[PDB]
Amino acid sequence: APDRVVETYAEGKPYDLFFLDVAGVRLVGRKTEAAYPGPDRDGLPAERLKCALVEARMLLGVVERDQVAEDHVAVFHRPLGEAEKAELFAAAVADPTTDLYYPYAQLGDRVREVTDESARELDHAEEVLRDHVPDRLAELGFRGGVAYDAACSTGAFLQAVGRRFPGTRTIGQDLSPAMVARARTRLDEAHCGDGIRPAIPEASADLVVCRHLNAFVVGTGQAHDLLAAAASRCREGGLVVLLGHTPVLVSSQWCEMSGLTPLQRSGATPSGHALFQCYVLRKG
Amino acid sequence: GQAPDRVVETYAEGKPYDLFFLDVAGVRLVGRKTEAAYPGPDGLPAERLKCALVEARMLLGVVERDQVAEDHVAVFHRPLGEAEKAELFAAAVADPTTDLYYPYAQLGDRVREGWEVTDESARELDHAEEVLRDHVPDRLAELGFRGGVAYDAACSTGAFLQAVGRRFPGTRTIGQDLSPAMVARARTRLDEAHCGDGIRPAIPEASADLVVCRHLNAFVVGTGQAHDLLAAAASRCREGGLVVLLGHTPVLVSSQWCEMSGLTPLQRSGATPSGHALFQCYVLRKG
Numbered sequence: 147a148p149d150r151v152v153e154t155y156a157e158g159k160p161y162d163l164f165f166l167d168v169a170g171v172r173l174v175g176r177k178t179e180a181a182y183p184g185p186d187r188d189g190l191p192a193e194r195l196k197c198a199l200v201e202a203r204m205l206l207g208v209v210e211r212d213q214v215a216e217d218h219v220a221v222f223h224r225p226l227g228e229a230e231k232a233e234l235f236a237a238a239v240a241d242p243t244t245d246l247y248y249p250y251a252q253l254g255d256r257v258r259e260v261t262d263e264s265a266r267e268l269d270h271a272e273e274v275l276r277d278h279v280p281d282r283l284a285e286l287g288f289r290g291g292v293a294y295d296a297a298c299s300t301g302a303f304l305q306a307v308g309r310r311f312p313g314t315r316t317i318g319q320d321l322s323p324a325m326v327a328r329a330r331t332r333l334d335e336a337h338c339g340d341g342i343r344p345a346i347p348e349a350s351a352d353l354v355v356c357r358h359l360n361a362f363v364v365g366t367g368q369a370h371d372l373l374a375a376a377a378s379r380c381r382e383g384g385l386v387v388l389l390g391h392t393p394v395l396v397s398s399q400w401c402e403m404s405g406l407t408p409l410q411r412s413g414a415t416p417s418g419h420a421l422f423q424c425y426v427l428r429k430g
Numbered sequence: 431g432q433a434p435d436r437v438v439e440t441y442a443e444g445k446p447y448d449l450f451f452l453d454v455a456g457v458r459l460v461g462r463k464t465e466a467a468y469p470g471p472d473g474l475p476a477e478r479l480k481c482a483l484v485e486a487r488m489l490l491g492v493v494e495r496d497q498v499a500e501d502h503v504a505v506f507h508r509p510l511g512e513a514e515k516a517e518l519f520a521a522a523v524a525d526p527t528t529d530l531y532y533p534y535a536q537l538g539d540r541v542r543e544g545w546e547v548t549d550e551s552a553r554e555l556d557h558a559e560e561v562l563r564d565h566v567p568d569r570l571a572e573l574g575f576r577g578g579v580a581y582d583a584a585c586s587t588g589a590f591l592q593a594v595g596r597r598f599p600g601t602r603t604i605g606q607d608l609s610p611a612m613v614a615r616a617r618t619r620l621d622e623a624h625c626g627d628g629i630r631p632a633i634p635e636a637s638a639d640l641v642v643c644r645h646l647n648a649f650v651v652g653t654g655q656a657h658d659l660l661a662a663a664a665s666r667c668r669e670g671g672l673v674v675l676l677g678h679t680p681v682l683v684s685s686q687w688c689e690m691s692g693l694t695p696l697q698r699s700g701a702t703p704s705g706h707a708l709f710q711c712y713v714l715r716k717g
């Protein structure tokens with residue numbers, strides 16, 4: 147018999163309901179505090195953090211049907227055992243094409259600050275991801291060139307990419323001038339301005355990074371406009387990378403309709419204990 | 431293996447309630463309801479009518495993912511060929527357990543926007559339910575229904591419950607409807623007809639052999655109201671009895687919620703004898 151998971155709009159968090167499309171089977175989970183950056187060691191337990199990471203223990207069951215109503219979102223599912231959760235979660239870790247998405251990230255009222263500690267906070271929450279992406283870009287054929295970060299933040303991420311591919315020109319852009327001030331110490335080039343006004347000519351970058359198309363940063367319409375803005379900077383055959391601390395607001399299906407063929411959709415921690423969103427797309 | 435497509439319905443002017451899902455062969459298909467060939471298929475062309483009927487031509491593709499946004503709902507899907515739709519639609523016709531539902535029926539503005547019922551208006555409703563009247567009584571016989579007390583919580587003109595009372599003679603037909611103009615017409619068709627909100631059922635608790643609900647649907651009630659009314663109507667059904675959910679407009683209660691409430695679905699959709707059309711027809715056994 148099926149079960150129902152609910153997130154109300156007034157005080158619930160619809161953006162915490164994630165879907166995992168594994169092996170033609172859709173699973174539903176509720177994101178909680180994840181073990182960050184790695185799993186609990188033998189004698190030292192890992193710290194918890196609300197971040198991009200999902201783990202098997204946050205899975206709920208096998209999605210049968212949803213019902214989006216006036217004041218809440220409901221997902222009907224058949225519950226999964228703890229061992230069944232881990233095995234299906236492992237199959238998603240073994241397949242980076244697995245989509246991890248949050249279909250209700252723009253529902254509810256909850257979705258409706260640059261300091262020295264605030265820059266350190268987001269840099270820490272993106273660590274498990276700075277460790278993953280540059281190596282994974284090498285395995286996907288990235289050879290270097292011009293790397294464009296449309297919302298570079300401190301610039302630590304794009305700098306990590308430029309370290310992995312020596313000779314890559316790192317060009318950052320951020321809306322916050324406090325962000326740009328820091329990013330100029332880590333990047334060859336950092337511009338102050340909204341991503342909707344890109345600072346580089348079109349089709350001039352071999353890698354475009356988008357970390358701002360996400361819940362609590364932009365709305366749905368804006369995220370799709372900024373996606374078309376950042377991707378217009380990518381040359382043909384180049385790579386577009388979408389990820390984020392908070393749920394990405396664009397689907398990989400929309401990217402495919404935009405001519406951005408997904409090469410991978412999610413990534414896992416080296417231990418395999420967690421999954422996160424990591425869309426790597428090839429512009430056609 | 432097909433690059434996706436997108437079907438959109440806006441809340442302000444679109445019709446999200448017209449997007450239907452077909453859960454056939456362990457996969458979800460998406461379609462948009464248009465005017466169906468009613469009551470039967472076409473060498474004379476049948477009349478077209480917005481009703482409970484969906485046809486294979488109304489399918490769009492295989493659901494990949496949806497995105498319920500602030501001002502619209504989108505469904506990403508791989509489009510199906512016309513021959514492919516009929517093949518999958520025929521497999522749904524051949525399995526009345528196929529769930530046909532409208533998961534966005536309670537979203538949008540159109541579903542948010544008198545004393546007299548004329549003779550022609552009563553004719554209008556009975557005609558829209560004719561395919562449904564021809565099907566359920568014969569289908570309820572094949573599912574073990576032997577008779578007793580048949581309670582219709584929103585009997586409307588009463589013609590539907592009268593059809594049931596004819597397939598199973600000796601059954602006491604109890605009607606109820608919010609509208610007093612409905613009750614007056616249903617009194618001429620049923621053993622008794624009561625005026626009142628189905629949230630206050632006019633029939634003893636846990637005493638009916640069959641409960642019919644045509645009011646748990648879009649444009650009739652809200653979502654929370656539909657669930658409260660379902661609880662009230664099913665509460666009149668005796669253990670082991672049958673509860674039937676159906677509607678001219680999309681049914682607002684999920685089959686999964688019926689199973690959570692002790693109502694085991696024996697079938698979820700029905701098909702015209704021609705097999706050309708499908709419609710929602712939940713038959714639930716109470717435990």
Ligand SMILES: Nc1ncnc2c1ncn2[C@@H]1O[C@H](CS)[C@@H](O)[C@H]1O
Binds near residue numbers: 322
């Ligand atoms: N529309 C936009 N264009 C460029 N950068 C943006 C942005 N919206 C947010 N950001 C930038 O993205 C970073 C992570 S939230 C943050 O440093 C913010 O300044």
Ligand SMILES: Nc1ncnc2c1ncn2[C@@H]1O[C@H](CS)[C@@H](O)[C@H]1O
Binds near residue numbers: 645
């Ligand atoms: N809350 C309610 N209780 C009983 N009947 C209701 C109702 N809401 C609508 N109805 C009745 O159901 C029928 C739907 S086509 C219609 O004849 C209306 O009078």
